[PDB]
Short mmCIF file of all heavy atoms in Angstrom, two decimals:
data_model
loop_
_atom_site.label_atom_id
_atom_site.label_comp_id
_atom_site.label_asym_id
_atom_site.label_seq_id
_atom_site.Cartn_x
_atom_site.Cartn_y
_atom_site.Cartn_z
N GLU Q 1 16.96 -4.50 -2.35
CA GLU Q 1 16.45 -3.20 -2.76
C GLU Q 1 15.29 -3.32 -3.73
O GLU Q 1 14.49 -2.39 -3.86
CB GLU Q 1 17.58 -2.36 -3.37
CG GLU Q 1 18.69 -2.05 -2.38
CD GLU Q 1 19.67 -1.03 -2.92
OE1 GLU Q 1 19.43 -0.49 -4.01
OE2 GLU Q 1 20.68 -0.78 -2.24
N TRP Q 2 15.17 -4.46 -4.43
CA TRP Q 2 13.99 -4.68 -5.25
C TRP Q 2 12.83 -5.23 -4.42
O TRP Q 2 11.67 -4.98 -4.76
CB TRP Q 2 14.31 -5.61 -6.42
CG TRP Q 2 14.63 -7.04 -6.05
CD1 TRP Q 2 15.86 -7.58 -5.84
CD2 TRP Q 2 13.69 -8.10 -5.84
NE1 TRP Q 2 15.75 -8.90 -5.52
CE2 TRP Q 2 14.42 -9.25 -5.51
CE3 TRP Q 2 12.29 -8.18 -5.89
CZ2 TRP Q 2 13.82 -10.47 -5.23
CZ3 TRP Q 2 11.69 -9.39 -5.62
CH2 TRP Q 2 12.45 -10.52 -5.29
N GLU Q 3 13.12 -5.97 -3.35
CA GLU Q 3 12.05 -6.45 -2.48
C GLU Q 3 11.39 -5.30 -1.72
O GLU Q 3 10.17 -5.26 -1.59
CB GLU Q 3 12.59 -7.49 -1.50
CG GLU Q 3 12.96 -8.80 -2.14
CD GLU Q 3 13.36 -9.85 -1.14
OE1 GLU Q 3 13.68 -9.50 0.01
OE2 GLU Q 3 13.34 -11.05 -1.48
N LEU Q 4 12.19 -4.35 -1.22
CA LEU Q 4 11.63 -3.19 -0.54
C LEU Q 4 10.91 -2.27 -1.52
O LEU Q 4 9.89 -1.68 -1.17
CB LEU Q 4 12.73 -2.43 0.20
CG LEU Q 4 12.29 -1.25 1.07
CD1 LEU Q 4 11.35 -1.69 2.18
CD2 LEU Q 4 13.50 -0.53 1.65
N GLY Q 5 11.44 -2.14 -2.73
CA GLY Q 5 10.82 -1.25 -3.70
C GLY Q 5 9.46 -1.71 -4.16
O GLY Q 5 8.56 -0.90 -4.38
N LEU Q 6 9.29 -3.02 -4.34
CA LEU Q 6 7.99 -3.56 -4.72
C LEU Q 6 7.03 -3.59 -3.54
O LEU Q 6 5.82 -3.43 -3.73
CB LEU Q 6 8.15 -4.96 -5.31
CG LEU Q 6 8.82 -5.02 -6.68
CD1 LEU Q 6 8.89 -6.45 -7.16
CD2 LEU Q 6 8.07 -4.16 -7.68
N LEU Q 7 7.54 -3.80 -2.32
CA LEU Q 7 6.69 -3.73 -1.14
C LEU Q 7 6.11 -2.33 -0.95
O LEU Q 7 4.92 -2.18 -0.66
CB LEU Q 7 7.49 -4.15 0.10
CG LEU Q 7 6.80 -4.10 1.46
CD1 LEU Q 7 5.63 -5.06 1.53
CD2 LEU Q 7 7.80 -4.40 2.56
N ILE Q 8 6.93 -1.30 -1.12
CA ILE Q 8 6.43 0.07 -1.08
C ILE Q 8 5.44 0.30 -2.21
O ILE Q 8 4.41 0.96 -2.03
CB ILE Q 8 7.60 1.07 -1.12
CG1 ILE Q 8 8.47 0.94 0.13
CG2 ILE Q 8 7.09 2.49 -1.28
CD1 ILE Q 8 9.65 1.88 0.15
N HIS Q 9 5.75 -0.22 -3.39
CA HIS Q 9 4.82 -0.14 -4.52
C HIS Q 9 3.52 -0.87 -4.22
O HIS Q 9 2.43 -0.38 -4.54
CB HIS Q 9 5.50 -0.72 -5.76
CG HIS Q 9 4.63 -0.74 -6.98
ND1 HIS Q 9 4.16 0.41 -7.57
CD2 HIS Q 9 4.17 -1.76 -7.72
CE1 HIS Q 9 3.43 0.10 -8.62
NE2 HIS Q 9 3.42 -1.22 -8.74
N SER Q 10 3.60 -2.05 -3.60
CA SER Q 10 2.40 -2.78 -3.23
C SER Q 10 1.60 -2.03 -2.17
O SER Q 10 0.38 -2.20 -2.09
CB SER Q 10 2.75 -4.18 -2.74
OG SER Q 10 3.42 -4.91 -3.74
N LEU Q 11 2.26 -1.21 -1.37
CA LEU Q 11 1.58 -0.43 -0.34
C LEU Q 11 0.97 0.84 -0.92
O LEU Q 11 -0.25 1.02 -0.90
CB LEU Q 11 2.56 -0.09 0.78
CG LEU Q 11 2.91 -1.20 1.76
CD1 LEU Q 11 4.17 -0.84 2.52
CD2 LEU Q 11 1.75 -1.38 2.71
N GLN Q 12 1.81 1.74 -1.43
CA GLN Q 12 1.31 3.04 -1.86
C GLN Q 12 0.54 2.97 -3.17
O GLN Q 12 -0.29 3.86 -3.42
CB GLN Q 12 2.46 4.04 -1.99
CG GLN Q 12 3.43 3.78 -3.12
CD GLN Q 12 4.43 4.89 -3.30
OE1 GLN Q 12 4.30 5.95 -2.70
NE2 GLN Q 12 5.45 4.66 -4.11
N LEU Q 13 0.78 1.96 -4.00
CA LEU Q 13 0.14 1.81 -5.32
C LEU Q 13 0.38 3.11 -6.08
O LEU Q 13 1.53 3.57 -6.15
CB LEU Q 13 -1.33 1.42 -5.14
CG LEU Q 13 -1.69 0.16 -4.35
CD1 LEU Q 13 -3.19 -0.02 -4.35
CD2 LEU Q 13 -1.00 -1.07 -4.90
N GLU Q 14 -0.65 3.74 -6.65
CA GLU Q 14 -0.49 4.99 -7.37
C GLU Q 14 -1.72 5.86 -7.12
O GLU Q 14 -2.75 5.39 -6.63
CB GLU Q 14 -0.29 4.76 -8.87
CG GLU Q 14 1.03 4.08 -9.23
CD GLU Q 14 1.12 3.67 -10.68
OE1 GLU Q 14 0.07 3.57 -11.34
OE2 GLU Q 14 2.25 3.46 -11.17
N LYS Q 15 -1.59 7.14 -7.44
CA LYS Q 15 -2.73 8.05 -7.37
C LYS Q 15 -3.80 7.61 -8.35
O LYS Q 15 -3.56 7.53 -9.55
CB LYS Q 15 -2.28 9.48 -7.69
CG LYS Q 15 -1.19 10.02 -6.78
CD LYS Q 15 -1.66 10.12 -5.34
CE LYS Q 15 -2.81 11.10 -5.20
NZ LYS Q 15 -3.23 11.23 -3.78
N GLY Q 16 -5.00 7.36 -7.83
CA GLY Q 16 -6.07 6.78 -8.61
C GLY Q 16 -6.29 5.30 -8.38
O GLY Q 16 -7.22 4.73 -8.96
N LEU Q 17 -5.47 4.68 -7.54
CA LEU Q 17 -5.60 3.28 -7.17
C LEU Q 17 -5.87 3.18 -5.68
O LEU Q 17 -5.56 4.10 -4.91
CB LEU Q 17 -4.34 2.49 -7.54
CG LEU Q 17 -4.27 1.79 -8.90
CD1 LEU Q 17 -4.53 2.74 -10.05
CD2 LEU Q 17 -2.91 1.14 -9.06
N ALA Q 18 -6.44 2.05 -5.26
CA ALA Q 18 -6.77 1.86 -3.86
C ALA Q 18 -6.84 0.37 -3.55
O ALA Q 18 -6.95 -0.47 -4.45
CB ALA Q 18 -8.09 2.54 -3.49
N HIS Q 19 -6.76 0.06 -2.27
CA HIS Q 19 -6.93 -1.30 -1.77
C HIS Q 19 -8.39 -1.56 -1.42
O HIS Q 19 -9.22 -0.65 -1.40
CB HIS Q 19 -6.06 -1.54 -0.54
CG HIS Q 19 -4.59 -1.55 -0.82
ND1 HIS Q 19 -3.88 -2.72 -1.01
CD2 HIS Q 19 -3.69 -0.54 -0.93
CE1 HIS Q 19 -2.61 -2.43 -1.23
NE2 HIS Q 19 -2.47 -1.12 -1.19
N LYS Q 20 -8.70 -2.82 -1.15
CA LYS Q 20 -10.01 -3.22 -0.67
C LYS Q 20 -9.81 -3.98 0.64
O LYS Q 20 -9.10 -4.98 0.67
CB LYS Q 20 -10.74 -4.09 -1.70
CG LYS Q 20 -11.05 -3.39 -3.00
CD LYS Q 20 -12.54 -3.17 -3.23
CE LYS Q 20 -13.14 -2.15 -2.30
NZ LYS Q 20 -14.57 -1.94 -2.61
N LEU Q 21 -10.45 -3.49 1.69
CA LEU Q 21 -10.23 -4.00 3.04
C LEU Q 21 -11.56 -4.29 3.70
O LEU Q 21 -12.52 -3.53 3.53
CB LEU Q 21 -9.42 -2.99 3.87
CG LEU Q 21 -9.08 -3.31 5.32
CD1 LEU Q 21 -8.14 -4.49 5.43
CD2 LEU Q 21 -8.49 -2.08 5.99
N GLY Q 22 -11.63 -5.37 4.45
CA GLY Q 22 -12.77 -5.63 5.30
C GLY Q 22 -13.97 -6.22 4.59
O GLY Q 22 -13.93 -6.71 3.46
N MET Q 23 -15.09 -6.14 5.30
CA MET Q 23 -16.31 -6.83 4.94
C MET Q 23 -17.04 -6.14 3.80
O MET Q 23 -16.92 -4.92 3.60
CB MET Q 23 -17.23 -6.93 6.16
CG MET Q 23 -18.48 -7.76 5.96
SD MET Q 23 -19.65 -7.64 7.32
CE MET Q 23 -18.71 -8.37 8.64
N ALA Q 24 -17.80 -6.93 3.04
CA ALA Q 24 -18.72 -6.44 2.01
C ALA Q 24 -18.01 -5.63 0.94
O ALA Q 24 -18.47 -4.57 0.52
CB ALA Q 24 -19.86 -5.63 2.64
N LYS Q 25 -16.87 -6.15 0.48
CA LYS Q 25 -16.18 -5.53 -0.65
C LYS Q 25 -17.01 -5.58 -1.93
O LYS Q 25 -16.77 -4.77 -2.83
CB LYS Q 25 -14.82 -6.19 -0.88
CG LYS Q 25 -13.82 -5.98 0.26
CD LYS Q 25 -12.46 -6.59 -0.06
CE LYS Q 25 -12.42 -8.09 0.13
NZ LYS Q 25 -12.41 -8.46 1.57
N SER Q 26 -17.98 -6.50 -2.01
CA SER Q 26 -18.86 -6.56 -3.17
C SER Q 26 -19.80 -5.37 -3.23
O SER Q 26 -20.19 -4.94 -4.33
CB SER Q 26 -19.68 -7.85 -3.13
OG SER Q 26 -18.85 -8.98 -2.96
N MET Q 27 -20.19 -4.83 -2.08
CA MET Q 27 -21.19 -3.78 -2.01
C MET Q 27 -20.59 -2.38 -2.06
O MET Q 27 -21.33 -1.40 -1.91
CB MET Q 27 -22.01 -3.93 -0.73
CG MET Q 27 -22.62 -5.30 -0.55
SD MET Q 27 -23.54 -5.43 0.99
CE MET Q 27 -23.91 -7.18 1.01
N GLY Q 28 -19.29 -2.25 -2.26
CA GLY Q 28 -18.64 -0.96 -2.29
C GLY Q 28 -17.99 -0.52 -1.00
O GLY Q 28 -17.60 0.64 -0.89
N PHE Q 29 -17.87 -1.41 -0.03
CA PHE Q 29 -17.22 -1.11 1.24
C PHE Q 29 -15.76 -1.53 1.19
O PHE Q 29 -15.45 -2.66 0.82
CB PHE Q 29 -17.92 -1.82 2.40
CG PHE Q 29 -19.34 -1.39 2.63
CD1 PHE Q 29 -20.39 -2.00 1.95
CD2 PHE Q 29 -19.63 -0.39 3.55
CE1 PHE Q 29 -21.69 -1.61 2.17
CE2 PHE Q 29 -20.94 0.00 3.77
CZ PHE Q 29 -21.97 -0.61 3.08
N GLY Q 30 -14.86 -0.61 1.55
CA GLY Q 30 -13.49 -1.00 1.80
C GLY Q 30 -12.40 -0.37 0.97
O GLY Q 30 -11.26 -0.82 1.00
N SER Q 31 -12.72 0.68 0.21
CA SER Q 31 -11.71 1.38 -0.56
C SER Q 31 -10.82 2.20 0.38
O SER Q 31 -11.29 3.15 1.02
CB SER Q 31 -12.36 2.27 -1.61
OG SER Q 31 -13.07 1.50 -2.56
N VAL Q 32 -9.55 1.83 0.47
CA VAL Q 32 -8.59 2.49 1.34
C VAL Q 32 -7.32 2.79 0.56
O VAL Q 32 -6.88 1.99 -0.27
CB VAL Q 32 -8.26 1.63 2.59
CG1 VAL Q 32 -9.46 1.54 3.50
CG2 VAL Q 32 -7.79 0.25 2.19
N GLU Q 33 -6.73 3.95 0.82
CA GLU Q 33 -5.48 4.37 0.20
C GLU Q 33 -4.40 4.45 1.27
O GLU Q 33 -4.61 5.05 2.33
CB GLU Q 33 -5.64 5.71 -0.50
CG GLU Q 33 -4.40 6.15 -1.23
CD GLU Q 33 -4.57 7.46 -1.97
OE1 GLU Q 33 -5.67 8.04 -1.90
OE2 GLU Q 33 -3.60 7.91 -2.61
N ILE Q 34 -3.25 3.83 1.00
CA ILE Q 34 -2.12 3.83 1.92
C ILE Q 34 -1.09 4.82 1.41
O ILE Q 34 -0.81 4.89 0.21
CB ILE Q 34 -1.50 2.43 2.06
CG1 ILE Q 34 -2.51 1.46 2.68
CG2 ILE Q 34 -0.23 2.48 2.88
CD1 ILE Q 34 -1.98 0.06 2.85
N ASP Q 35 -0.54 5.61 2.32
CA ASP Q 35 0.52 6.56 2.01
C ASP Q 35 1.71 6.30 2.93
O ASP Q 35 1.54 6.25 4.15
CB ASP Q 35 0.02 7.99 2.15
CG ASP Q 35 1.03 9.02 1.69
OD1 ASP Q 35 1.31 9.07 0.48
OD2 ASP Q 35 1.54 9.78 2.54
N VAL Q 36 2.88 6.12 2.34
CA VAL Q 36 4.12 6.00 3.11
C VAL Q 36 4.56 7.39 3.54
O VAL Q 36 4.57 8.33 2.75
CB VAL Q 36 5.21 5.30 2.28
CG1 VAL Q 36 6.52 5.25 3.06
CG2 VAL Q 36 4.77 3.90 1.90
N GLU Q 37 4.93 7.52 4.81
CA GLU Q 37 5.34 8.80 5.37
C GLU Q 37 6.71 8.78 6.05
O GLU Q 37 7.23 9.85 6.35
CB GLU Q 37 4.29 9.31 6.36
CG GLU Q 37 3.91 8.31 7.43
CD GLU Q 37 2.76 8.77 8.28
OE1 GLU Q 37 2.30 9.92 8.08
OE2 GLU Q 37 2.30 8.00 9.14
N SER Q 38 7.30 7.61 6.28
CA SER Q 38 8.62 7.54 6.90
C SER Q 38 9.25 6.18 6.64
O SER Q 38 8.62 5.15 6.88
CB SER Q 38 8.52 7.79 8.41
OG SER Q 38 9.78 7.62 9.03
N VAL Q 39 10.49 6.19 6.16
CA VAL Q 39 11.32 4.99 6.07
C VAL Q 39 12.57 5.24 6.91
O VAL Q 39 13.33 6.17 6.64
CB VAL Q 39 11.70 4.64 4.62
CG1 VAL Q 39 12.56 3.40 4.59
CG2 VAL Q 39 10.45 4.43 3.78
N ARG Q 40 12.78 4.41 7.92
CA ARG Q 40 13.94 4.51 8.80
C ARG Q 40 14.72 3.21 8.75
O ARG Q 40 14.16 2.13 8.99
CB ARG Q 40 13.52 4.83 10.24
CG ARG Q 40 12.90 6.20 10.40
CD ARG Q 40 12.33 6.43 11.79
NE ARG Q 40 13.35 6.39 12.84
CZ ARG Q 40 13.53 5.37 13.68
NH1 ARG Q 40 12.76 4.30 13.64
NH2 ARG Q 40 14.50 5.45 14.58
N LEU Q 41 16.01 3.31 8.46
CA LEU Q 41 16.86 2.15 8.22
C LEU Q 41 17.83 1.96 9.38
O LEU Q 41 18.32 2.94 9.95
CB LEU Q 41 17.64 2.31 6.92
CG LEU Q 41 16.80 2.46 5.65
CD1 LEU Q 41 17.70 2.70 4.46
CD2 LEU Q 41 15.95 1.22 5.43
N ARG Q 42 18.11 0.71 9.70
CA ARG Q 42 19.12 0.37 10.70
C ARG Q 42 20.46 0.25 10.00
O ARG Q 42 20.72 -0.74 9.30
CB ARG Q 42 18.76 -0.92 11.42
CG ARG Q 42 19.83 -1.42 12.37
CD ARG Q 42 19.67 -2.89 12.62
NE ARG Q 42 20.60 -3.42 13.60
CZ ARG Q 42 21.82 -3.86 13.33
NH1 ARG Q 42 22.32 -3.80 12.11
NH2 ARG Q 42 22.55 -4.39 14.30
#
C-alpha cells in the first residue's frame, strides 16, 4: 500500500507540478501533467 501510494504520487505529483517528456526539455518542450482517473483492483 506504500508502493502504490508513492507510485500514484510519482504520477499525479501535485497541482503546480509537472513532468518533462520528450525532446528538447532544455528549450521548454515537454511539460506534461498526469491525472489519475480510475483505480481498479483484482
Side-chain angles (χ1 to χ4, degrees):
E1 297 190 6
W2 68 266
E3 290 186 342
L4 185 61
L6 290 181
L7 178 63
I8 295 179
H9 178 64
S10 300
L11 284 163
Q12 69 173 349
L13 303 181
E14 293 171 340
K15 302 297 297 182
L17 267 55
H19 292 263
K20 297 247 70 178
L21 179 66
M23 186 189 295
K25 294 183 282 287
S26 308
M27 307 178 188
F29 296 88
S31 296
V32 292
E33 184 178 0
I34 297 180
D35 186 68
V36 177
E37 53 187 356
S38 176
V39 180
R40 294 172 63 255
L41 300 176
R42 174 202 184 272

